[PDB]
Amino acid sequence: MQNKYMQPIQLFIVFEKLNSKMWISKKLNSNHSIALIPSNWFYSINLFLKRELLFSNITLIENSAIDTISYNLETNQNDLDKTNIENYFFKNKMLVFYNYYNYFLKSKLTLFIILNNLNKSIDSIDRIFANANWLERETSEMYGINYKWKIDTRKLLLDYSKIENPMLKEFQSEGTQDAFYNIFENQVVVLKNETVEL
Amino acid sequence: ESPKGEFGVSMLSDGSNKPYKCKVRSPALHHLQVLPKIGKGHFLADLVALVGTVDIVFGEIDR
Amino acid sequence: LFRGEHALRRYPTGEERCIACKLCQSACPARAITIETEPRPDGSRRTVRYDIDMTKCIYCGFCQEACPVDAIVEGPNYEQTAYLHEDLFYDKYKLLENGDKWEPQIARNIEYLINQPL
Amino acid sequence: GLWSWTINQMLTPKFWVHLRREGFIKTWTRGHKASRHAHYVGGNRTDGYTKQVGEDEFGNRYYEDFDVDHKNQRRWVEFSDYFMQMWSNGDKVPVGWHGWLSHQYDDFPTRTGNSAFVKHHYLKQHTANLSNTPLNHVPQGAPQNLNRMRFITAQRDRSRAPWQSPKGEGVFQGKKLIVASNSPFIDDMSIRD
Amino acid sequence: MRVDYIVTPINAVVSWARQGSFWPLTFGLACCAVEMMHATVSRYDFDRFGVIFRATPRQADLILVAGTLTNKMAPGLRRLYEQTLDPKWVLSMGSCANGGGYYHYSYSVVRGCNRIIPVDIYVPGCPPTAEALMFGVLQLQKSLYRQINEGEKKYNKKDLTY
Amino acid sequence: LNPYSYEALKENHWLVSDSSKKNSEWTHKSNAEQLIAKVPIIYVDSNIVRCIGGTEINAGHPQVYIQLDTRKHGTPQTCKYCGLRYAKKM
Amino acid sequence: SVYGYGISRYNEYKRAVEDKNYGPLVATSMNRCIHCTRCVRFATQIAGVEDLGKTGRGKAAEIGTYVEKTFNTELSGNVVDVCPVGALTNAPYAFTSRPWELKSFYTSDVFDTLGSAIQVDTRGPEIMRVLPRIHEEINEEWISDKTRHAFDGLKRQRINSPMKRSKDGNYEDIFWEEAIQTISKKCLNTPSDQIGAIIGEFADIESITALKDFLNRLDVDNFEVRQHGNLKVSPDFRANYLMNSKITGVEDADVLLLVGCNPRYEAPVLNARILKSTRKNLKVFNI
Amino acid sequence: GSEKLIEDRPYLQGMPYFDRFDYVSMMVQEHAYCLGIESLLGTTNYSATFTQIRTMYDELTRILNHLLAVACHALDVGSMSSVFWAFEEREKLMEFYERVCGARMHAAFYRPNEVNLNAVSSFLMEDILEFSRNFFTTLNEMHNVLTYNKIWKQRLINIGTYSFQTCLDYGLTGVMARSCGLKRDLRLSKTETYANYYYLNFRSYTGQHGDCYDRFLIRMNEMCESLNIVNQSINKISKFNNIVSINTKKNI
Amino acid sequence: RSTQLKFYDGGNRQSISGIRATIFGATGFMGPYIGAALGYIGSDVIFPHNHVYAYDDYVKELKLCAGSGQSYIMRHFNYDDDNMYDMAIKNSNVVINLVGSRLQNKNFQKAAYANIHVAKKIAEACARNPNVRRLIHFSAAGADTKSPSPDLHTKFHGEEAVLNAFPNATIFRPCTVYGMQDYFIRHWIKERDWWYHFNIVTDDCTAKRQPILINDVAQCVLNALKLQESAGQIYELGGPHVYSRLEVFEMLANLSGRPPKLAHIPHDIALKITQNFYNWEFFNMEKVIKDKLDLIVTGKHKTISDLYVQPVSFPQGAEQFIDDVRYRGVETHDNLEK
Amino acid sequence: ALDNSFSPENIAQVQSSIGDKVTNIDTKALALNHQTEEYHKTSKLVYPIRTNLVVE
Amino acid sequence: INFGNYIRERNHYRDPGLIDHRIQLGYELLYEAEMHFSQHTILMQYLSPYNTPLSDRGYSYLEKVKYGNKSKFLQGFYKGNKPTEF
Ligand SMILES: NC(=O)C1=CN([C@@H]2O[C@H](COP(=O)(O)OP(=O)(O)OC[C@H]3O[C@@H](n4cnc5c(N)ncnc54)[C@H](OP(=O)(O)O)[C@@H]3O)[C@@H](O)[C@H]2O)C=CC1
Ligand code: SF4
Ligand code: SF4
Ligand code: SF4
Ligand code: SF4
Ligand code: SF4
Ligand SMILES: [Zn+2]
Ligand SMILES: [Zn+2]
């Protein structure tokens, strides 16, 4: 609208075995296209993106995940159709989204992947985009995502000697432990926490 | 276009008075990530100068 | 407009302005305000507890904007440094005496701010 | 605190006018009451000294000089207590003078006449920071409070008031123990007619 | 009794000196650190009151906690406090340090730096203006000046302490 | 009169009263009840009175309207924001 | 907020209404009434009382009783839940709480032998209010006043620790171990035929199962010591002592015969159901 | 754990968290959050755009951030005095914050659909123009101890050099992307502009070597262009022409 | 009077145990540990003190024994006014007295003031207040009415006075307590570091000791509070084994690798010099006098086993406190990495 | 305590009750202000801007 | 043996991908321990005994003597699960 736009349809032309599901919205920028991608083709798709002409001049802008196991419409429950992208947030255990920008085509591309396995396994693309190292490390530690063929799997932002995924809906924002100084040991320890409530 | 680069918010709402998801895209994280790439082979003084040149703030990086 | 130390105000007659509507409690982003209310024997609704954890507060002024009777305000005082962590647990006595001490300046500032839209 | 008025600052008409009018002790101590700059004692000018815009309930004096080299040094206060260097702190300025000295407004309190500030019957007098003194703020249940138990017991009794057990010797009817009821309400249907 | 004749005056000279050169540790977390650095520059000169920043804890006299303290940083803060030379004082600046602050309900934040190290004074704001930080530092300076002789000893019939 | 009696409760919105008004410095942590009781009744000519708790809008409380035409003539009424009491003149 | 224009243009005096006194359960603020008639219809058609109405005409009409009369009845507080505005409010629940600072739980009432489905709203360790639920086989939508308000009897006169009584009548707080050891010694020393129990009004299945198993282990088969006031019903069959036609049976029957029964006090919601059925050809006889 | 907290509050209660993201430039974070909320609401803040406050204060916080960055970088390199000046000249911008919201750093000023119109007065813009005029001089003062200094050049030139390929691989944006040579400015993008930026006239700068010297020069020039943008906005909310007498062409 | 004290020990720093305690003499070595043992389960602790330097870490760190709103430090305590004692224990159902004559002190009058007068005042204040359930008074194992040490004599007299004033008080007599900041291992390390070549001994080192770790005395206090049968009893607390001073020297030498060297000075010279010269922590009459006395469990009273505590052995418990002062001799290449 | 819509007698009575010596009000003065909307009172900053000095 | 007890408590796992994730986390925590990234009082939580006292300090056997032959339920009944003041 009032600008030149074209769908990224060549991606599904080259990958002939994939269904195509794309969205454009006025809540996004007028050059932003959202597409749905299966998990078992993500690495090959990123390989194609990194090198193909008019896609090679691309950068990875953002990466994150959505815990859709507790996603519920709170208002206007009768205004949902079969074409709404939020219709794909139901019954799906996990969602992962990647956002790239293309300088030649001056376009934003978001790709969505549905993870429906309990172990939450997906191939990493940090060997293709150098951005994905820290982004994927943070996503994996926050949401319990198991990334395969990753350069570095160590924790990025979480505390030492702890295993937890605080960004899951089951997790309470106050955690399960608190840090105190211990006189009997002359050093800091961690204890089960009792917290104030408003 | 924040003074430190492209700063973004990607947020999904379920129709209530609270956001269901809010993710913050900060450029200081990417700059700190690239710092080892451009800092290898340099001296310690050069590393300090490079940390100065990348306008990184850890409230944005860590959040 | 400076956001300093919190205070509870009074009407010119000496009556409390706060009617225990709990809008300021829900407006607080830091959850620093705790309020409990009982009917005063004369019938008016007043707080039996109104306290603010000043170590939780972010001094944002959302509570003074939410108040519909201008009861809770942020005063001009900033020299509120304390030696104990318990000196920053503000109860109703502390806020009331802060309002009773800083009332002239707060009144002048609020008068100008009110006249600004007019 | 020697040379509160320097020799170069002396021989100035301002110094002699101040000494002739105010005296020696008041003039000399003006360099101790405020310690901004050597050339600023009594005001930046030389022909005369700055008239005080006002005074204080604790004796502090407030001056405003428009001939200062930087805009931020227009208004200042000289305290009545100047016992040591690093002795007078910023919490001693009262309410209206606080706003005047911080350049919030251009109004200042006056002892008598038409005032720009309200004077209600419930106003308290300004007090300095009372921390690290026996008059600090104590929460009602803190161990420092000698009457902490009245507050704790009431908070407990808000949702669970314990039953007062009989104490001492009592009256027995078989095995039941007889006491008077604790209800403050009146059972009017047993007294009505 | 006679020793006091020498000790009581000299005490002042010991306090005055340590009140005249109060060197805090160069350590800042989050954005109370930015406010503190504002409080150090020429508009509010700590160097007027003999306050200059030293980078190592062995040369520091005051530890100034001026930001959020996470569970990842608590052992480091404890070590930094332990490795400072006595006598030392601790200033807690801002809400994140005085208590939990705006992150009191979080899973990775220490609910106040006084759970790890003792604190001598608290500065409440978020951020406390350079005005308020200077006020708190001056209050601490006066308190530590007076702290050497608070009248703990009793006076005998000769008006001599113990 | 007994504050727990039927008449006292009925004429006090079914609450236990306090004539001394000195229980509220502990229960409600202030002496506002005494101060508001020190203010006499305002007698209004008309049947309805408008209260804003001040000289101007936004300095006080939202506009409220109090009926003075009562079942019993001249019964005073209390503003529910400020404690001021009004009655119809004669 | 959702459907209105969002701003006003009315700039005149509003009408003011003097408040009425309905009793210690219902608080009135009649400036808020919108003349919706919900309270009148509830009182007439559900409660069965004819004390409410609309007197007057035009804008000056008023809702309520003509004379100074209390709204005394069971199921009175329910009218509050019917009124959409703050015109009628829960008088015990006055000014104490706000909706957003409450957590709700679903449970059932024990104050009357109808297990009314109820919702308990609490704030921290304090229970703040009780509301009705929807069941359509119990209490429909409504609860009695005792169910709604008598929960505040749990906040006082509470026993908070084990106690022992001396011969003179003095009570001393003791530990759990000492009390249990004393009772165990008494159980071991007392003959089987000298042991008895009394089953309380508020006794649940688990408690009675535990006590029955323990006393059976102690070779005790008596669970009453009171001489009179015992129910003369055999527990051999479930149909012996139960409501075989269920609560909804009052809708199914055409002739009801009460024998020593006062539904207005023992089950007010069942009384309302019977009233609804009698409006639909149900005949009631009483002995 | 700020994102979890934001997910645990209503929308307005999480907005101050953005103030604590990148606490050197505060109102840009609020602007991004409010833009996201407005996009989810499908509306625009006309009161903010027709008053030019968002663009103006975005440029002011841009000057704040670049002042702090340049001063701290010079302090790290070894130039000690320059940090005292940028901090004095960023005290005036802190006063400008305090005059509209009552806070010096964490404004919490921008709102999704509300603008406190009464907080903005004409006397504030004149002081902003005074600040701009003196900021020219202070920026020249910082200019003549660093730009042509041999030690500064030998410390920053050909240090941390990279090209556009790395600049794409590592997702570099902003000043770093303009130093690698890429022309990427969101304000000047046709489909991605916001808050009056598309209808002003300012310049943006790109380097040709991709090193620390280019970034330093770009930051100084960006401060100057921010001054220019602020002047343009104040001109857009100004009334220049007056009424003149019919005869003699004399102003009334 | 009632000695019952019901409390919940299954909580943490932010819980409510049910104990409100006042601890006297907490500006020494025991103080922080006893206060932490009480306040780590959610108790309220009050620390009255009159300390010469208020900025010393001996006062500030007492604030760490409990959380905010639970620990209070009462300053400028008179130790001579009955009103202050009443104010200190007004809302306390547990009182602990750790006041005692300090090692530097050699004056008999000051020793009596610390060990008898202050303890008597505390016990009398406890008797007046009817809400005090348990009082724990700390004494010495070798306390005796004919001891050459004024500290032990005055401590025996203080035991008598406390048991007279408050017949439901519990007396603890530790043998000798070691820890991070103690006068047993820390003094040994510092004396060897100052006298680089030797440790000074003024006797034949045949006196017997029964060391006990500081972490066990706190557990003993908690167990005594939990036990209602310990109300009016005297307990002597020591370690599992009894060693002579020479054996302790040898054990400390072997645990750290430092070769022992005990330079001997005759007893009378040391006594005269410590009598006629100024005394401080590392040079005083008390060390000279006590080095000839046995501080062990004598068996006349109840022992640590009656509190159901199993103390750790001295070699096992003292090893971690000398890790930094280990002898650096011939080591493997892998030991260079730390 | 009361706006202009109230009679001057009522305003004066309330002000006397709350003990208001400052801002005196008379029935003649309050009658003119009764039922009247007016702007806030103002002052003037008169140029030249200078310092007030004491000399001779 | 204590860490083996930890692993034994993790024996019921049957998803290989989850096990690979756990092995990655274990290697990460071991590397943190061996490079002084973590604190000893923090990392000792994985090496501490499950039902035995630590060897560097004494222990209390009071609750062993009083509740000698009593079952676990009785021991957990005599010792409450909440504070008793409130
Ligand atoms: N630790 C050990 O090896 C053993 C200790 N004990 C005894 O246990 C008790 C506690 O032990 P510990 O902490 O190690 O001993 P300390 O000597 O280190 O502490 C003594 C305490 O008593 C105070 N005190 C001393 N003299 C006076 C006085 N005249 N008036 C008021 N207060 C005074 C001190 O405070 P301040 O000086 O600051 O005023 C300090 O708080 C002492 O009585 C000690 O003798 C018994 C056996 C072994
Ligand atoms: S926002 Fe104002 S009126 Fe409401 S409960 Fe708070 S102080 Fe009271
Ligand atoms: S200023 Fe903000 S954070 Fe502080 S009490 Fe008010 S609403 Fe809460
Ligand atoms: S208390 Fe607030 S302003 Fe201060 S450092 Fe913390 S987040 Fe920043
Ligand atoms: S429910 Fe309320 S609005 Fe409706 S008729 Fe009744 S009092 Fe009026
Ligand atoms: S909450 Fe409802 S009934 Fe109450 S006044 Fe407001 S809109 Fe009307
Ligand atoms: Zn009113
Ligand atoms: Zn004797």
> Which ligand 1 atom is the nearest neighbour of the CA of I51?
38
CA dist., res. I245 & res. I291, Å (int): 8
In angstroms, the separation between the Cα of residue D17 and the nearest Cα of chain C is 36
CA dist., res. A185 & res. I320, Å (int): 11
CA dist., res. H187 & res. H189, Å (int): 6
Per-residue DSSP letter, G46: I
K65 phi/psi in degrees, rounded to 5: -80, -45
Q: From residue A13, give the alpha-carbon distance in Å to each of A7, A20, A46, E102.
A: 12, 10, 15, 50
Give the DSSP letter string of A120-187: -EEE--TTT-TTHHHHHHHHHHHH--EEES-S--S-SSSPTT----TTSTTS-TT-SEEEEEETTTTE
Tokens of C46: 């007043």
Q: What residue type is A146 in one-letter code?
A: N
Three-state DSSP class for residue G26: strand
Tokens of I36: 């932490």
Tokens of C69: 């009777």
- What is the CA H28 to chain-centroid distance, rounded? 8
Q: Is G220 within 8 Å of G247 (Cβ atoms)?
A: no
Peptide bond into E87 cis (omega under 30): yes
CA dist., res. I312 & res. I321, Å (int): 14
Per-residue DSSP letter, G47: I
CA dist., res. B55 & res. H62, Å (int): 12
Which of G29, G88, G89, when mutated, tests ligand 5's pocket best, judged by the most ligand atoms within 8 Å of its CB? G88
In angstroms, the separation between the Cα of residue C71 and the nearest Cα of chain D is 16
Tokens of H92: 């005036």
Residue E30: list chain B partners with CB under 8 A.
58-59
**Closest-CA residue to E107 (of C29, A191, A176):** A176
- Compare CB distances from E89 to I51, I53, I55 and report the shortest one's residue: I55
Q: How many CA atoms lie within 13 A of I148 on its CB side?
A: 11
**Apex CA G205: angle with CA G203 and CA G206, to 5°?**
100
**Apex CA H98: angle with CA H97 and CA H102, to 5°?**
125
Residue B59: list chain E partners with CB under 8 A.
30-31
Tokens of I300: 């006349």
Q: Is I82 within 8 Å of I121 (Cβ atoms)?
A: yes
**Closest-CA residue to I327 (of I249, I247, I253):** I253
Three-state DSSP class for residue G130: strand
* Bridge partners of residue I23, in order along the sequence: I96
**Apex CA I252: angle with CA I248 and CA I254, to 5°?**
115
Tokens of H197: 């930026």
What b/e string do you get for C101-117 counting C-beta neighbours within 10 Å, with b at 16 or more?
bbbbbbbbbbeeebeee
CA dist., res. C99 & res. C74, Å (int): 10
Q: Is I311 within 8 Å of K60 (Cβ atoms)?
A: no
Taking residue G177's Cβ as centre, other Cβ atoms within 10 Å add up to 15
G83 annotated to a ligand binding site: yes
**Which 3-state string (H, E, C) describes chain H?**
CHHHHHHCCCHHHHHHHHHCCCCCCCHHHHHHHHHHHHHHHCCCCHHHHCCCHHHHHHHHHHHHHHHHHHHHHHHHHCCCCHHHHHHHHHHHHHHHHHHHHCCCCCCCCCCCCCCCHHHCCHHHHHHHHHHHHHHHHHHHHHHHHHCCCHHHHHHHCCCCCCCHHHHHHCCCCCHHHHHCCCCCCCCCCCCCCCCCHHHCCCCCCCCCCCCHHHHHHHHHHHHHHHHHHHHHHHHHCCCCCCCECCCCCCEC
- Which ligand has the shortest distance to the CA of I25? 1
Q: Which helix (H) or strand (E) holds E135?
A: helix E130-146
CA dist., res. C26 & res. C6, Å (int): 17
Taking residue K54's Cβ as centre, other Cβ atoms within 10 Å add up to 11
Tokens of I194: 């100052």
- Per the rule left: phi > 0, alpha: psi between -120 and 50, beta: everything else, G64 is left
Q: Which residues contact H117 (CB under 8 A, 6 or more apart)?
A: H47, H51
Between β-strands A187-192 and B8-12, what pairing exists: parallel, antiparallel or unpaired? unpaired
Distance from the alpha carbon of residue I147 to the mean position of ligand 8, in angstroms: 10
Picking from E26, E29, E34 by the largest number of H CB atoms within 10 A of its own CB, the best residue to mutate is E34
CA dist., res. E13 & res. D25, Å (int): 28
Give the DSSP letter string of G202-261: S--HHHHHHHHHHHHHTT-------SS-------SSGGGSS-TTTTTHHHH-SEEEESS-
Between β-strands C89-90 and C72-74, what pairing exists: parallel, antiparallel or unpaired? unpaired
Taking residue G219's Cβ as centre, other Cβ atoms within 10 Å add up to 10
Q: Which residues contact F46 (CB under 8 A, 6 or more apart)?
A: F68, F88
G45 phi/psi in degrees, rounded to 5: -95, -20
Between β-strands A107-115 and A94-102, what pairing exists: parallel, antiparallel or unpaired? antiparallel
Helices E4-20 and E130-146, axial angle in degrees (round to 10): 170
Outline where DSSP puts E strands in chain I: 20-24, 44-48, 71-74, 94-97, 134-138, 169-174, 176-178, 199-201, 208-209, 211-213, 234-237, 243-244, 262-264, 302-303, 309-310
- Which ligand has the shortest distance to the CA of F66? 7
Three-state DSSP class for residue A16: coil
Which of G3, G30, G32, when mutated, tests ligand 6's pocket best, judged by the most ligand atoms within 8 Å of its CB? G32
Indicate yes or no: CB of G159 within 8 angstroms of CB of D159: no
Distance from the alpha carbon of residue C114 to the mean position of ligand 2, in angstroms: 19
For B62, which residue in chain E has the nearest alpha carbon? Answer: E30
Indicate yes or no: CB of I63 within 8 angstroms of CB of E151: no
CA dist., res. K71 & res. K77, Å (int): 10
Q: Flag whether residue J55 sits within 8 Å of chain C, measured between CB atoms.
A: no
User: How many residues are recorded in chain H?
Assistant: 252
In angstroms, the separation between the Cα of residue D137 and the nearest Cα of chain I is 13
Indicate yes or no: CB of A160 within 8 angstroms of CB of E107: no
**Closest-CA residue to C25 (of C50, C56, C54):** C50
Cα torsion G111, G113, G118, G122: sign? positive
Indicate yes or no: CB of C46 within 8 angstroms of CB of F32: yes
Q: Indicate if ligand 3 lies below 6 Å from the C-beta of C66.
A: no
CA dist., res. C50 & res. A25, Å (int): 47
Q: Going by CA atoms, what residue is nearest to atom 46 of ligand 1?
A: I140
Which of C35, C72, C92, when mutated, tests ligand 2's pocket best, judged by the most ligand atoms within 8 Å of its CB? C72
Q: Is D45 within 8 Å of D51 (Cβ atoms)?
A: no
Tokens of B13: 């709402």
Outline where DSSP puts E strands in chain D: 49-50, 52-55, 61-64, 75-78, 171-173, 176-178
* Bridge partners of residue I94, in order along the sequence: I21, I134
Between β-strands J53-54 and I262-264, what pairing exists: parallel, antiparallel or unpaired? unpaired
Cα torsion D43, D49, D53, D55: sign? positive
Q: Which residue has the tokens 């343009």?
A: H232
Residue G161: list chain I partners with CB under 8 A.
6
Per-residue DSSP letter, E4: H
CA dist., res. H207 & res. F85, Å (int): 75
CA dist., res. D158 & res. G125, Å (int): 10
Q: From residue B18, give the alpha-carbon distance in Å to each of E103, G100, H8, J21.
A: 18, 14, 7, 52
User: How many residues are recorded in chain B?
Assistant: 63
Q: Which helix (H) or strand (E) holds F48?
A: strand F48-51
Q: Which residues of H touch C (CB under 8 A)?
A: 9, 12-14, 16, 98-103, 106, 108, 118-119
Q: Which residue has the tokens 């647990």?
A: C89
- How far separated are the first and last CA of chain E, in Å rounded? 6
Q: Is A146 within 8 Å of A140 (Cβ atoms)?
A: yes
CA dist., res. E100 & res. B61, Å (int): 20
Resolution (A): 2.6
Q: What residue type is H160 in one-letter code?
A: G
CA dist., res. C97 & res. C10, Å (int): 11
Q: Indicate if ligand 3 lies below 6 Å from the C-beta of C67.
A: no
Q: Is C12 within 8 Å of J18 (Cβ atoms)?
A: yes
Q: Is C100 within 8 Å of D122 (Cβ atoms)?
A: yes
**Closest-CA residue to G188 (of G165, G214, G223):** G214
User: How many residues are recorded in chain I?
Assistant: 338
**Apex CA E79: angle with CA E75 and CA E84, to 5°?**
155
Three-state DSSP class for residue G118: strand
Q: Is G31 within 8 Å of G18 (Cβ atoms)?
A: no
CA dist., res. H188 & res. H204, Å (int): 9
Q: Which helix (H) or strand (E) holds E121?
A: strand E121-123
Taking residue A149's Cβ as centre, other Cβ atoms within 10 Å add up to 10
Three-state DSSP class for residue I117: helix
In angstroms, the separation between the Cα of residue A136 and the nearest Cα of chain K is 14
Q: Which residues contact H151 (CB under 8 A, 6 or more apart)?
A: H78
Q: Going by CA atoms, what residue is nearest to atom 8 of ligand 1?
A: I138
Residue E139: list chain D partners with CB under 8 A.
89, 129, 131-132
Helices H53-77 and H82-101, axial angle in degrees (round to 10): 160
CA dist., res. A39 & res. A55, Å (int): 20
Indicate yes or no: CB of E106 within 8 angstroms of CB of H5: yes
Residue C51: list chain F partners with CB under 8 A.
none
Three-state DSSP class for residue C76: coil
Outline where DSSP puts E strands in chain G: 26-28, 54-55, 62-63, 88-90, 103-108, 117-123, 126-132, 163-165, 171-173, 255-258, 283-286
Q: Which helix (H) or strand (E) holds C72?
A: strand C72-74
* Bridge partners of residue G163, in order along the sequence: G173
Q: Flag whether residue E89 sits within 8 Å of chain I, measured between CB atoms.
A: yes
Tokens of I82: 């009955």
Q: Is A136 within 8 Å of A147 (Cβ atoms)?
A: yes
Three-state DSSP class for residue I68: coil
Distance from the alpha carbon of residue C23 to the mean position of ligand 2, in angstroms: 6
What b/e string do you get for H140-159 counting C-beta neighbours within 10 Å, with b at 16 or more?
eebeeebeeeeebeebbeeb
Q: Is C54 within 8 Å of C28 (Cβ atoms)?
A: no
Per-residue DSSP letter, E3: T
Q: Is I52 within 8 Å of I75 (Cβ atoms)?
A: no
Indicate yes or no: CB of G161 within 8 angstroms of CB of I6: yes
